[PDB]
Design a protein around this ligand. Sequence first.
Ligand SMILES: CCCCCCCCCCCC[N+](C)(C)[O-]
Ligand SMILES: CCCCCCCCCCCC[N+](C)(C)[O-]
Lengths: 477, 477
Amino acid sequence: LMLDYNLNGTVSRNYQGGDSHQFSYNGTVGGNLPWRLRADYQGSQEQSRYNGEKTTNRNFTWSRFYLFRAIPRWRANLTLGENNINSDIFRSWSYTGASLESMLPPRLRGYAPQITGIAETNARVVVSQQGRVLYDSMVPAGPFSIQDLDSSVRGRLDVEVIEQNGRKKTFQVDTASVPYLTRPGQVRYKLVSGRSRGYEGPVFATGEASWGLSNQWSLYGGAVLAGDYNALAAGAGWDLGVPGTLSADITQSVARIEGERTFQGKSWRLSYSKRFDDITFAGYRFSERNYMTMEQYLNARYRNDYSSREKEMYTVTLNKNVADWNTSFNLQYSRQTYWDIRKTDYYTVSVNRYFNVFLQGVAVGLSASRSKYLGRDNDSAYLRISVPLGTGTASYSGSMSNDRYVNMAGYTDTFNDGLDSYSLNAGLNSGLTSQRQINAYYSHRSPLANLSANIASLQKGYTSFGVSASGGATITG
Amino acid sequence: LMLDYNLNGTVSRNYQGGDSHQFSYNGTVGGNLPWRLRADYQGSQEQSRYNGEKTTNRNFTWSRFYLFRAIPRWRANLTLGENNINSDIFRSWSYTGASLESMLPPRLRGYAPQITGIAETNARVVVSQQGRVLYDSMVPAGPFSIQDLDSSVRGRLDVEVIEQNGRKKTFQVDTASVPYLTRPGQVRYKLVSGRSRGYEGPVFATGEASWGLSNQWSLYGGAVLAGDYNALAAGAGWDLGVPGTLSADITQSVARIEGERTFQGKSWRLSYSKRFDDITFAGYRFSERNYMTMEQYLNARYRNDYSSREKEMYTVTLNKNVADWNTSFNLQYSRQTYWDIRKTDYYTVSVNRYFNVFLQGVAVGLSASRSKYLGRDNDSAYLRISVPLGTGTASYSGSMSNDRYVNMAGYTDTFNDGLDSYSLNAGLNSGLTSQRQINAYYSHRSPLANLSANIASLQKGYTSFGVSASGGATITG
Ligand SMILES: CCCCCCCCCCCC[N+](C)(C)[O-]
Ligand SMILES: CCCCCCCCCCCC[N+](C)(C)[O-]
């Protein structure tokens, strides 16, 4: 019986008084009985004490836990228990039930949705989808690129960057929606049944299939039979060569909510993907005022929420490594508009060049990003020149988050071959009298157990300490 | 005695009443007596009639006219009369006097500053620098790329896009400031003298030179001796190979204005350029509160203007043609900040892909840009699919200027091999009840004489007719 723990803990004081605690954990229990196991758990506890009020927000749940078993001979996998639907045609909601679903040319499957951004401090970053916790551990200040996500992540993700000074900056990233294509002989499909979760739960079945026409083309369809909510979708997909693959989808919905009225709508979606084995992906989507996803409907029927009616959604992704002049470029953009509320443009860019000027690998990196700090836009840029000095490396950093700019000097030293490392930094925040910053971050990365602690302190500001451990153990008595 | 005329004329009516006239002209007189001639003239007249008031704004001037003569044997050219300083180290002001200045590896000289943007209507676009008229003729609605500029344009340009509906959108473009480098043996220099113009005029001399150190490097300097304004500048330049060339400059200023005070300041400037014979240029500049250019000083002493104190200026330019997947990409960006006023970010992007889907060269183009419409930001995007149909080509266009979006259908036919062409368009503006749009644009492009007329009419809107002729003639009695 396997366990995959992930822990976080942080303590901090204010220069005005307050203490606060933060402990979070998430992980997965696995078991083997052709009957396989998978239980995802996640929880957190937060406390704060000011002049008069302590506050506490505490949460725990099994996001999802189910049994799944492989079958030799339909190349299909059966899974039953509490899960989440993962579709290449429909969007996601959580459910209890079972499902039967069909390794083949990568150019047709989905890949790991690498999330990127920028942190003012040494910050804990949590990536989620719906309520499910996909990633939440600490990051050292500066641009960050989380490439630890489950091979099967789909849809758009919710990222929260909780900074050491108490500022929560949040944004959204859209994972690439790779064309649901197939090779002529084969057939891809996904037929799921059960009742929708967490709002007993309305009964629903959903099917989705991908036919292999005799050309470099392929047609797919799917339907959602939820009763008060039904949706049908058909789509055409086309394969190319190295110039990537492509596809388009039209999907209509019928939703009937009590004494409220009845909504009808469709949404068209065009997506292109040139990744295989430089990755580039561009996707588009435009949906009607009355078109709703299974999720949208549910929040509408059970929670009385009709907010966030999607209109148009553009999303571009380019991670191109020109080994040629020794520079990598990554772009993650996602513009999203609505019928009821204001547009929401989220992006993050970075370009890293490796130089030779005096000895090897002097590094200059420029990064820029925009997220949201409490409704209002938060716009950042980061400039870092790093000089490698033996097993260590000294660096200078210039940060510009909104109207507050930070200057940083620091030395980082690595050991155990890159597994462990330890860095000390000192700097100045100005943008409002200036403050001196002192900060140290330590990391240990063994494959069976990771661990990392960091301590930070701002003048007339805050002072906090945080640890973050994650590893693998077998819990069987 | 040569003449290079350029004319524009437009008439239009309002749906509420008004008529208006617009006539502009600019050109250059040339003459040969080793004594060469060059006279630039420019003028315009505008009239309007509403309920009660007609108005008229009329202007004419010889921007600049001077004599210049080549000399065999110092590979230098002497020019005297009323001109404008053009320096690779200093910024521009206009002056009466004479100058002596030093074809050689392109990687060190300057190129044609191609200006780009987007027009709602069939619009006349005027490009200028200081007050001097560099370009002003009509453009057919959609993205536009003016590549007619004098080989020697330097500094940043002022672009105004006067639309057929009466909306003036304006912005700024920074021409690439190519590194003032030289080959070891040779020496580049520029020593100018006279009095500053148009505010008799303060006396000034200015010198600038480029030495050829024995490496792929090169050092340059220059000074401005204006009396109440002095400035000295030194800079290092470095040449590479195909990875372009580079350079950095530090320049200090001393300005003394009466009973006002005395300003001191410097500004650092780093510029990289990878163009020769795909062009890419990135430049940076950061100047002190009290640092002033010769121009800045003059507006300060003679016009009592201390506005627009430059702080930081970033500028990027990328025009890369991937013949490989038959698509071109052009990016013109320029962020500019100040000490006294708000930031000013101007940009324009476009990507054009040529397809094959049914016959040859079906075209999809996406363009986006941001300029200023009366203090406020004006943000546009344009989508155009064009299908070639013999000597003609039918197209569909989607425009989005701010909150007003336009849909357009149109057929264009070309003849005389691309020299002449004629297109008719019809569309809808919605963003405020919608309106039908009818528009035709004709162009004739013979090398000795160009001419173009266009007629446009919006429902419950405006209705205008415009002509634009430009050619070469010899006026000698
Ligand atoms: C062995 C096959 C695995 C079970 C596949 C489930 C798909 C059946 C769907 C039918 C309807 C289910 N329902 C009505 C309860 O939602
Ligand atoms: C034949 C050489 C061409 C004339 C070059 C002019 C540079 C001389 C500058 C000295 C000062 C001129 N000044 C004081 C009137 O400005």
